[PDB]
Write a structure and sequence with these properties.
Number of domains of chain A: 1
Number of strands of chain A: 8
Largest sheet of chain A: 3 strands, antiparallel
Function (chains A, B): Catalyzes viral DNA integration into the host chromosome, by performing a series of DNA cutting and joining reactions.
Strand order of the largest sheet of chain A: 4-1-8
Number of helices of chain A: 0
Protein name (chains A, B): Integrase
Structural class of chain A: mainly beta
Bound molecules: chloride ion
Subunit structure (chains A, B): Homotetramer; further associates as a homohexadecamer.
Organism (chains A, B): Maedi visna virus (strain KV1772)
Order of helices and strands of chain A: EEEEEEEE
Oligomer: homodimer
């Protein structure tokens, strides 16, 4: 059930480096929530800036 | 189990008007996720800026 992903943030629309992997804490409609361990804050990430790690085959 | 709340955001530390009511979409450690009705955007709200609405007696 636990999902992991890579994610990135945006600075004035410019995409940042891929960060993670980190646990997908919540999955919404078009976005997820992750815990950014640098700032220790929850971040809302749009799905276009998420790379979901495929579950084990 | 559906939880609703009032929430507020701050402008340079000053708390604004209470907004909502709106559904508590996710509960984390010290913060929640809501969807802003006006902007259709997910927001992370620190618990001290949340008023959870109790169910009827
Ligand atoms: Cl946070």
């Amino acid at each position: 059930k636990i999902r992991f992903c890579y994610y990135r943030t945006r600075k004035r629309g410019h995409p940042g480096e891929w960060q993670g992997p980190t646990q997908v804490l919540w999955g919404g409609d078009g976005a997820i929530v992750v815990k950014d361990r640098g700032t220790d804050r929850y971040l809302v990430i749009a799905n276009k800036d998420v790379k979901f790690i495929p579950p084990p085959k």
